[PDB]
Amino acid sequence: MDKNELVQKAKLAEQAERYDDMAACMKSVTEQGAELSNEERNLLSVAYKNVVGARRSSWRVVSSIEQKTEGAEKKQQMAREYREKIETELRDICNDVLSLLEKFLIPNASQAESKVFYLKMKGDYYRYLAEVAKKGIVDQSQQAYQEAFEISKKEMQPTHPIRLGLALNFSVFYYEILNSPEKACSLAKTAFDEAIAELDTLSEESYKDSTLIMQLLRDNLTLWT
């Protein structure tokens, strides 16, 4: 249909908390080939984060039951198989996102904010694959993030929410995926410290987003230290 119609439907889906519907609307919108607008990009992002999120949460629950049922033959076998079924849906989602990114989003990103958002997203989704894989997925996640990290350090101020959000997820990648808490803490601390050094650059538009991310950064640092 017309993009505004699909966008309308995605927004209705969003209010209905029907995220698979929301993502299918935004996937159709992206497959129309035109660079997404700020609003369109965010809808696609919310949609998919919620769709993959439900499966990551179920996966963690079933994975933790699988560990806890060591010594319980039947329970563990059932847990393992259900984990594998969840894991496939999770990879199918991640793979759908990653192909949207490679085919459409990254290639049409016209401004540095957009390129960083999408390369981050690519690091995120590879990082969600790494959570259930750890395999050369790790390198894809790392390279995406690194490249996003480099562009945001040059093109964005330290308090820009996209740049902070990227710092936050790349620090989580180091911590959880590469098991490098010292690198994770240094990345988060740097980003936090550089942003609080420039609080006068917080804008009306981005204030809440930026400060919420600064606090997540500091809260992570608190936990990792």
Binding site: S45, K49, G53, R60, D124, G165, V172, Y175, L216, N220
Partner: peptide, 8 residues
């Protein structure tokens, strides 16, 4: 997970 990444 006690630590967080960027919320939707």
């Amino acid at each position: 997970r006690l630590y967080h990444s960027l919320p939707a």
